A paper describes a structure:
Here we report near-atomic models built into cryo-EM structures of procapsid I, intermediate procapsid II which has partially released the SP, and the mature DNA-filled capsid from bacteriophage SPP1. The structures are T = 7 laevo icosahedra composed of 415 copies of the MCP [name] (35.4 kDa), several hundred copies of SP gp11 (23.5 kDa) inside procapsids, 180 copies of gp12 in DNA-filled capsids, and a gp6-gp7 complex which forms the specialised portal vertex. The asymmetric units (ASUs) comprise seven SPP1 [name] subunits: six in a hexon (subunits A to F) and one from the capsid penton (subunit G).
Procapsid II is larger, more angular and has a much thinner shell than procapsid I, ranging between 2 and 2.7 nm. Procapsid II has bulky density for the SP attached to the capsid lattice interior only underneath the MCP five−fold vertices. The hexon becomes less skewed in procapsid II, more flat and expands to a size of 16.5 nm × 14.2 nm with the central opening getting slightly larger (~3.0 nm × 3.7 nm). The transition from procapsid I to procapsid II is induced by major structural rearrangements in the hexon subunits that become flattened resulting in expansion without major changes in the pentons. Subunits A-E of the ASU undergo significant conformational changes in the P domains and N-arms during transition from procapsid I to procapsid II. In procapsid I all MCP subunits are bound to the SP gp11 protein via the N-terminal helix α1* (Phe15-Leu26), positioned beneath the capsid shell and the N-terminus of the spine helix α3 from the same subunit. These interactions are disrupted in subunits A–E of procapsid II where helices α1* unfold to an extended strand similar to the one found in the MVC. In the SPP1 procapsid II intermediate state, SPs are associated only to MCP subunit F of hexons and to all subunits forming pentons (central panel), demonstrating that this interaction is more stable than the one of SP bound exclusively to hexons.
Residue numbers in the entry:
A (entry chain F), C (entry chain G): 2 to 324
B (entry chain A): 56 to 217
Write the structure that this text describes.
């Protein structure tokens, strides 16, 4: 058909392009990390492959002073040690196309299919991490200091409960940046409050703002239902700075192959990456595997945290939607 | 029609002891149909020379603007075709009949957000005069006079109005 | 091992050779026209396809003659109504070899492999035809006036009943060209009439002839049986001049691939064409698919047509063999 950079498969000149555009286009960003610690490098790249390491830490000395008084002596004190974990995950999928369609629309090879696949993974992470918090951080007594709800049919989501939730970190404020928002909410928001369209990029328009924050319109969210048609939403609020990840490399990032007896040709991607909040430690219990983790069971149960209280940093409030 | 898109049905966990399989792509199944029209009209003659002018000229220099109202005449009809009698499009129509609600400040929001994630994919608002009268009584419709010089392209919320 | 214009697969210099040699070798011809309309090329070669575009019919006659005169209008040449459709079919197969060297593949790979393909791939054509044509008359009323029998206990198939069939073409007589047949008939012929081997070209060889016609012979034609152990034959008569067909092309008419663990290599052809009577429109009723169809389904039912009587042009008559 054409020069076919992918269909005659130049593996160079292509894969770096795809990865980078995948990074910039997707947002989030930021919010979350850019270029996390090389810790996740040593977990990602070869050599010393996964699964994940464990890294330690020394909590700070603490204790009372003692009465300094003669005719008595002192007693010394000690330090402790602690543990931390991460995970590693793998992904991939195919494409069933016929090169007739792929470069039918594609035509000029460079921008077309690359831009597409980029936009693809851009949504993929947005699905995976946003699923990663989901069960864990909500289900425990251990985080409850970070969850408050107005639910059970008195609460409005406006102008007050938002503030109080935003102060659920007592001393530490003004580290928070982005507000995760499902659509219908922000609908109820434009219906009432002052939510203020702010134009930064000159000249471009614009990312919406609530109060010195960046709200984020996001399609896929949790939602539940009770009887009596009453609804409940989640809408995480963090803008922490940050989560973390590092890209890492597989072998054969791009592969082109075809089948003689039928008529097809297909594509594959299969990228590695390492992402996890630091944040709670990860463990192994009562799960399948391994590795990588999962989706479902990579959420449903069994995480364990140690810091604790501050510098997590994420908070959730389930609120009912305004009448 | 030359449709295009990429995304499907994801995602899948890379592991040995399994194979990936592909996922099919929506093809060009979008379909349309050619239409064609026309007409013709005569004159008189002896009436032309007897009237003190020529009908043929005036009619012939009025021919151009005729086809506009035809084009509109098709389009309105046709859209009114898509949305009728189909539950398959129903997410795009919002019926405030049954005698409450005026078109102010809310049902407008319902419209502009009825596309859940995608907002500001809309620009101009179709309107009947008397309505925007009922708007300018209450509503905030704000006059940005920008094109030098023109009066005026009204605006409600980062939109245009026609 | 060899020059291997197929194994190292030069797409030039081959496919055209295939198609041409196919046209010369297999016949028919004529009978059926060569080089039909190129709107069919729009059917195979994109765009315009889909289910098969319609072919016009052309001749000059309107009601000749009309009275040259004065004080009288002539009135014009009018085109009677009509419409039709067709099918469009896609076929192919593969071929196997082995690594224990059945080879050679001589000094002319081109003509060797090419022609040896042309034999087969040309030969299936007429099988598809008769298979199909068995469908019009199969059991249908609207063609009844184009079928005739002298059969059921008296007919000789010689010199007269044939003249009846010669009436059966409604307007046009002595437009006959070819005669379908089955062998035993033309045996009885050799016993009776003058059916005459006639060298056509000087010197080139040669078409068996009834009367200035090219007879065609194949073993597959309907043969049914009443009680009393006697046989009934079909032997279509058309010699319309003609049916029609045109080609178009897919992508990759020639392909070469191999197997790894097992020891093999394979070839494939896969070309498309459009051929049918005109004749009847082709509709989708109680018929699987799609598209193309089948042999069986190309038999079963659902052919309805508009002319009616003339420019069909095919006639069948069932009769007893000489006794």
């Amino acid at each position: 058909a054409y020069t076919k950079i992918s269909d005659v498969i130049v593996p160079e000149l292509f894969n770096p392009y795809v990865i980078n555009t995948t990074t910039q286009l997707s947002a989030f960003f930021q919010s979350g990390i850019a270029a996390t610690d090389d810790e996740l490098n040593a977990l990602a790249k070869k050599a010393g492959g996964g699964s994940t390491l464990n890294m330690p830490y020394w909590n700070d000395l603490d204790g009372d002073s003692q009465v300094l008084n003669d005719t008595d002596d002192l007693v010394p004190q000690k330090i402790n040690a602690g543990q931390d974990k991460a995970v590693l995950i793998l992904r991939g999928n195919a494409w069933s196309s016929h090169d007739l369609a792929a470069t039918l629309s594609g035509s000029d090879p460079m921008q077309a299919i690359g831009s597409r696949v980029a936009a693809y993974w851009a949504r993929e992470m947005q699905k995976i991490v946003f699923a990663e918090l989901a069960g864990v951080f909500s289900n425990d007594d251990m985080k409850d200091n970070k969850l408050d709800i107005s639910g059970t049919a008195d609460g409005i989501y406006s102008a007050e409960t938002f503030v109080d939730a935003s102060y659920k970190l007592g001393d530490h404020e003004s580290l928070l940046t982005a507000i995760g928002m499902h659509s219908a909410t922000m609908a109820s928001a434009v219906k009432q409050d002052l939510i203020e369209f702010v134009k930064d990029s000159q000249s471009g328009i614009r990312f919406p703002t609530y109060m010195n924050k960046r709200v984020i319109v996001d399609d896929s969210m949790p939602v539940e239902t009770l009887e009596d048609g009453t609804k409940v939403f989640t809408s995480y609020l963090f803008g922490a700075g940050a989560l973390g990840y590092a890209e890492g490399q597989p072998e054969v990032p791009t592969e082109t192959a075809r089948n003689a007896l039928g008529s097809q040709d297909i594509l594959i991607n299969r990228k590695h990456f390492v992402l996890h909040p630091r944040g709670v430690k990860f463990t192994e219990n009562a799960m399948a595997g391994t590795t990588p983790t999962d989706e479902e069971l990579a959420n449903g149960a069994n995480w364990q945290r140690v810091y604790d209280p501050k510098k997590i940093r994420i908070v959730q409030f389930k609120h009912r939607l305004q009448a």
